[PDB]
Design an enzyme around this catalytic site. Structure first.
Site, PDB file in Angstrom:
ATOM      1  N   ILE A   1     -21.437  28.850 -20.030  1.00  0.00           N
ATOM      2  CA  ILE A   1     -20.042  29.270 -21.020  1.00  0.00           C
ATOM      3  C   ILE A   1     -20.590  29.833 -22.334  1.00  0.00           C
ATOM      4  O   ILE A   1     -19.749  30.258 -22.932  1.00  0.00           O
ATOM      5  CB  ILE A   1     -19.270  27.966 -21.014  1.00  0.00           C
ATOM      6  N   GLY A   2     -21.927  29.841 -22.311  1.00  0.00           N
ATOM      7  CA  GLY A   2     -22.416  30.338 -23.668  1.00  0.00           C
ATOM      8  C   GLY A   2     -23.793  30.918 -23.540  1.00  0.00           C
ATOM      9  O   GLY A   2     -24.404  30.414 -22.893  1.00  0.00           O
ATOM     10  N   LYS A   3     -24.319  31.677 -24.491  1.00  0.00           N
ATOM     11  CA  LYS A   3     -25.624  32.330 -24.465  1.00  0.00           C
ATOM     12  C   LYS A   3     -26.233  32.037 -25.754  1.00  0.00           C
ATOM     13  O   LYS A   3     -25.653  31.968 -26.697  1.00  0.00           O
ATOM     14  CB  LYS A   3     -25.484  33.910 -24.509  1.00  0.00           C
TER      15      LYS A   3
ATOM     16  N   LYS B   1     -29.146  29.082 -22.421  1.00  0.00           N
ATOM     17  CA  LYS B   1     -27.701  29.147 -22.246  1.00  0.00           C
ATOM     18  C   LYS B   1     -27.069  27.839 -22.738  1.00  0.00           C
ATOM     19  O   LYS B   1     -27.666  26.862 -22.952  1.00  0.00           O
ATOM     20  CB  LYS B   1     -27.504  29.476 -20.965  1.00  0.00           C
ATOM     21  N   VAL B   2     -25.682  27.787 -22.894  1.00  0.00           N
ATOM     22  CA  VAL B   2     -25.073  26.569 -22.650  1.00  0.00           C
ATOM     23  C   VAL B   2     -24.211  26.672 -21.439  1.00  0.00           C
ATOM     24  O   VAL B   2     -23.870  27.758 -20.851  1.00  0.00           O
ATOM     25  CB  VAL B   2     -24.039  26.703 -23.862  1.00  0.00           C
TER      26      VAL B   2
ATOM     27  N   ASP C   1     -22.553  26.771 -41.319  1.00  0.00           N
ATOM     28  CA  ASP C   1     -22.118  27.873 -40.367  1.00  0.00           C
ATOM     29  C   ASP C   1     -20.629  27.569 -39.951  1.00  0.00           C
ATOM     30  O   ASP C   1     -20.283  27.625 -38.665  1.00  0.00           O
ATOM     31  CB  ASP C   1     -23.142  27.962 -39.212  1.00  0.00           C
TER      32      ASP C   1
END
EC number: 2.7.11.1
Length: 350
Positions: free
Chosen positions: A16-18, A23-24, A133
């Site tokens: 689902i993410g990078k 990765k995630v 952040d």
């Protein structure tokens, strides 16, 4: 049982993410069938790029935090190639995604977002943590539309009566005090309240209140803060506008930086903060399509869905580069501290 949770306790589902270090993924824990987000961190890349100390710092910070409006840590563990962080799965995805679909959020929804995040920020401060952040990319929704802070990659522990100077953040969200080159200076928790402001303004308007890029020189940015008046569309309520303005005070000392500053703010006199904390104030309608969707794409990656995936015991070592790597890997393996919140919970009821 006192059994260690590790990578074999899970089943890996969709990416689902990078990240630059891995990765995630969505995972399911085999026994409870509960779903989580898992962040991979490649040990070799981390050692080569000197990230290991930051990964450990993040884990240490996450181990001591739990709050309804954070993406909380549940497990950490390692194998030979990777370090792993398993945390709450937020099925609504990030706010950036919706901004990218040209969604503009209703004023009341944003009010309630602010209420939830402000409880998270206040909790962080009481735990001596600056996130550094805050921005739509890092705020995730659950399936009911509650918002949650994640990605503590640059979060810092700030000891009492100390200050922090190092420049780290996403520049269009970073507070003016972060850029001042006055030798007698620094910043603190208030920067997270600035970026919450920038984030809230952005959700309302569709764009940020200042034109700043990741490429813009520090000098231009200081100039932008000192010479821009933020446009507050007349369509917005004076109550919201005057909230946004207390979050976007250029002077950290005059900015809202504490749960109480908001609790006592007139706009907020209708808020039941026990209800906020207990997730009983749904912010509002959230569009169907969020970043997790399985709307078919032409992504070459993951159209191969049907496919399924005595050399280290020698103690080998070839050159100075490879020997230094091994020393560090050996040190990772030995220093890494397993965390398991289930165990912390069980051993609290004992």
């Amino acid at each position: 049982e006192n059994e260690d949770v590790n990578f074999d306790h899970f089943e890996i589902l969709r990416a689902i993410g990078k990240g630059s270090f891995g990765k995630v993924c969505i995972v399911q824990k085999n026994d409870t069938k509960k779903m989580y987000a898992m962040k991979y961190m490649n040990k070799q890349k981390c050692v080569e790029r000197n990230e290991v100390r930051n990964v450990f710092k993040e884990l240490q910070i996450m181990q001591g935090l739990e709050h309804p409006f954070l993406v909380n840590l549940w497990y950490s563990f390692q194998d030979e190639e990777d370090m792993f962080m398993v945390v709450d799965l937020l099925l609504g995805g990030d706010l950036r995604y919706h901004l990218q679909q040209n969604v503009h959020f209703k004023e009341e929804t944003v009010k309630l977002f602010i209420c939830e995040l402000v409880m998270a920020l206040d909790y962080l401060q009481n735990q001596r943590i600056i996130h550094r952040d805050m921005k739509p990319d890092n705020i995730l929704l659950d399936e009911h539309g509650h918002v949650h802070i994640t990605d503590f990659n640059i979060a810092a522990m700030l000891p009492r009566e100390t200050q922090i100077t190092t420049m780290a953040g996403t520049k269009p969200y970073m507070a003016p005090e972060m850029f001042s080159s006055r030798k007698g200076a620094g910043y603190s928790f208030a920067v997270d309240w600035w970026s919450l402001g920038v984030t809230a303004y952005e959700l309302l308007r569709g764009r940020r209140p200042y034109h700043i890029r990741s490429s813009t020189s520090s000098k231009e940015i200081v100039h932008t803060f000192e010479t821009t008046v933020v446009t507050y569309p007349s369509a917005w309520s004076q109550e919201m506008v005057s909230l946004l303005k207390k979050l976007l005070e250029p002077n950290p000392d005059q900015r809202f930086s504490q749960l109480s500053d908001v609790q006592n703010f007139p706009y907020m006199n209708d808020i039941n903060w026990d209800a906020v904390f207990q997730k009983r104030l749904i912010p509002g309608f959230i569009p169907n399509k969020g970043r997790l969707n399985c709307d078919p794409t032409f992504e070459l990656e993951e159209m191969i869905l049907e496919s399924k995936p005595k050399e280290k015991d020698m103690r080998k070592c070839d050159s100075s580069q490879t020997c230094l790597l091994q020393e560090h890997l050996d040190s990772v393996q030995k220093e890494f501290i397993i965390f398991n919140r289930e165990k912390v919970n069980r051993d609290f009821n004992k």
